[PDB]
């Protein structure tokens, strides 16, 4: 089965109100496991999943130092971007970075990532070959040239194929009995008269993990993806997730419709109806 290790990093400048806020959170699959927040009383990388409480002082000190080094890199990068885009100062801006590794069945690297966004738009991304960069606009081509002359990509490739996958494997070991478990969805269909002409059928899926799930409504064996209102998957707060998908159909015809649910915890998909 595939697993991933991902870090989501955000730096937000606040001109006149201090140094940029800098936050980093790490995830293994859909389970958050660490966090660093520059605005904490004592800024440091801290465990956010119980199974990380097993890592000692030396792990946390090194992680914290990498975070603080990256924090200064972001202070510099916010200033540089503002120059490249010739923006007025005094503006509050955002720099984001996502990096990590997805592994396959052999728990070996399958996809490595290291990419960035400025003010919420793509800036520059390491390509799947882990050697070249995709610059999103002209300012990024400037950054791309600098990185292409260094040999910058080789450095990330070595970390993604090595340390990244080795630490992911370690995390899966540490939290094995909770990280590899699944909670298959508990699903049901609710009914809501809308008029005196049509009714809303809502297919619910609750208490599942991991978060990936496919809910679909069908009529006579065909998908009704075009008529479906599908909310985004949302966290229940206990590590599990919820989602629902609804269709408005004719009164008295509700027995023609079936909801279909696919999920890693379901060897065979569910088929339900009102």
């Amino acid at each position: 089965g595939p697993h991933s290790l991902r870090y989501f990093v955000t730096a937000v400048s606040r001109p006149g109100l201090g140094e940029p806020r800098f936050i980093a959170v790490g995830y293994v699959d859909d389970t958050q496991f660490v966090r660093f927040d520059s605005d904490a009383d004592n800024p440091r990388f801290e465990p956010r999943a119980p199974w990380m409480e097993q890592e000692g002082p030396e792990y946390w000190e090194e992680q914290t130092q990498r975070a603080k080094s990256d924090e200064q890199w972001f202070r510099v990068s916010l200033r540089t971007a503002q120059r490249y885009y010739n923006q007025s100062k005094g503006g509050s801006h955002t720099f984001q970075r996502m990096f990590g590794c997805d592994v396959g069945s052999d728990w070996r690297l399958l996809r490595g990532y290291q990419q960035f966004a400025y003010d919420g738009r793509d800036y520059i991304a390491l390509n799947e070959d882990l050697k070249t960069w995709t610059a999103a606009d002209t300012a990024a081509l400037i950054t791309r040239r600098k990185w292409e002359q260094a040999g910058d990509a080789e450095y990330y490739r070595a970390y993604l194929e090595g340390e990244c996958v080795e630490w992911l494997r370690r995390y899966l070991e540490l939290g094995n009995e909770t990280l590899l478990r699944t909670d298959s969805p508990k699903a049901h269909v609710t009914y809501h008269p809308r008029s005196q002409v049509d009714v809303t059928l809502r297919c619910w899926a609750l208490g599942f993990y991991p978060a990936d799930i496919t809910l679909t409504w069908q009529l006579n064996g065909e998908d009704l993806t075009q008529d479906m209102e599908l909310v985004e998957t949302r966290p229940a707060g206990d590590g599990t997730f919820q989602k629902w998908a609804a269709v408005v159909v004719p009164l008295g015809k509700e027995q023609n419709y079936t909801c279909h649910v696919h999920h890693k915890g379901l060897p065979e998909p569910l088929t339900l109806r009102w």
Partner: peptide
């Protein structure tokens, strides 16, 4: 696990 960006923007 976390890793630093090497070159400047």
């Amino acid at each position: 696990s976390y890793v630093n960006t090497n070159m400047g923007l």
